Design a protein around this ligand. Structure first.
Ligand code: HEM
Ligand code: HEM
Ligand SMILES: N[C@@H](CCCNO)C(=O)O
Lengths: 213, 211
């Protein structure tokens, strides 16, 4: 694959990858830099095709929707059909060997990531640009927000729309890192799960550890 | 890295503070033949031999490692121009918090992007120096007083799989997107709403520290 994920760190099910994309829509969008420059990286909001009905169990084959600032050089750098990766970063925590209570050991960092790759297609119609930002509000306000109603701002969205660079990303490949102590003996994995259960900052990691088979 | 004027850190030390607080970077390099970039989550620290306040990232060497069997290691080759992105506290901003109209939602977030040449460490001594300073820095900040002494032999036994590296920072940019574009009373309402739950207090924390 285009992402290195050791055997024990594969998600139980394809659905875990879709879940992380929905949970952490603020992706890092990467494309090659010009003439041996470092990749361009932009934090961009990205959602699953809102027109999708049926349960979404796999990212491969679906289109993702996103936007960025047109004034961002990254926008002009993407040219035409640019091959890109968007990386989505889920729950994560430092793992002290103190938690293991074993010797010898080394520390690690438990973390979740999804990398999707395919060709970014820019949206140049204002109708499709407006669809992108309205679809994003509907998906993010419901999951992360405080019941705000976009209705009073629909004209405003249109009155500020030129700055938006909207895009579509057909997922050619999807890889998921779920690094959640699978490499450890079960009694040690229990100790990490129970440690992470004891603080809010680490509880989401404990929640994924608890759903592993 | 594109950073709008209002989202610049007040001081260079904020970029250093974010790197220190958020060491699991996304290391990116160019994909061969117009392919998408390679991306690896790697632990990166400030040069542990820097004694005295580290105020600026430009001019300084970052230490990291990854898996040698990771194909990203082979694709780096020697003298690759890389970006390492550190991601700090972040929270979705509901315009319900603004109590104004009209409005659009955003996402407050912190990133540091560093760029320069990645040099691969080959030296056994420099490779073991890298994972021990990584234990020293991260266990201090994130750990529970764990003593690596009893495990140094074990470090040495697994060391051959370590691909350790040095990143000379040529460029460092920091996004501190923290509602600075909003009027003062709105920034105040946002900071207040983030104050009252753990998921968001770290963002309220940085919004406090803005002048
Ligand atoms: C619903 C959640 C939303 C989030 C999380 C969000 C996030 C972002 C981010 C991170 C950028 C900067 C990308 C870059 O650096 O290149 C951006 C740019 C932009 N967004 Fe959105 N966005 C949202 C909704 C909207 C809506 C509803 C509008 C309405 C038109 C909008 C208009 C813009 C504009 C004009 C820009 C260009 C830069 C600027 O003028 O601020 N956004 N958005
Ligand atoms: C203290 C915190 C540490 C963290 C957060 C950490 C993190 C990581 C990560 C994320 C990778 C995978 C990179 C990739 O996917 O290519 C990795 C690989 C590796 N690290 Fe570390 N590391 C730490 C300390 C150490 C220590 C002390 C050793 C001792 C020798 C070590 C040995 C390795 C080895 C051998 C690999 C190759 C991957 C493997 O064998 O699974 N690490 N490390
Ligand atoms: N994967 C290692 C952990 C050491 C730090 N990172 O590799 C191991 O279990 O040997």
């Amino acid at each position: 694959g285009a992402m290195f994920v050791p055997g024990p760190y594969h998600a139980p099910e394809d659905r875990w990858l879709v879940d992380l994309v929905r949970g952490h829509p603020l992706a890092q969008l990467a494309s090659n830099g010009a003439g041996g420059a470092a990749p361009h990286i932009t934090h961009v909001p990205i959602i699953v095709d809102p027109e999708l009905d049926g349960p979404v169990d796999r990212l491969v084959g679906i289109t993702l929707w996103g936007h960025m600032n047109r004034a961002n050089p990254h926008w002009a750098a993407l040219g035409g059909a640019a091959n890109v990766v968007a990386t989505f970063a889920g729950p994560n925590a430092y793992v002290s060997p103190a938690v293991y209570r074993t010797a010898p050991a080394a520390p690690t960092w438990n973390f979740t990531s999804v990398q999707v790759r395919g060709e970014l297609r820019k949206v140049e119609s204002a109708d499709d640009t407006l669809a992108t930002v309205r679809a994003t509000v509907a998906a993010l306000e419901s999951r992360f927000g405080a019941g705000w109603d976009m209705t009073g701002s629909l004209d405003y969205f249109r009155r500020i729309l030129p700055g938006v660079g909207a895009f579509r990303l057909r997922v050619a490949e999807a890889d998921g890192m779920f690094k959640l102590s699978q490499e450890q003996q079960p009694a040690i994995r229990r100790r990490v799960r129970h440690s992470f259960g004891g603080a809010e900052a680490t509880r989401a990691v404990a929640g994924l550890m608890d759903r592993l088979p």
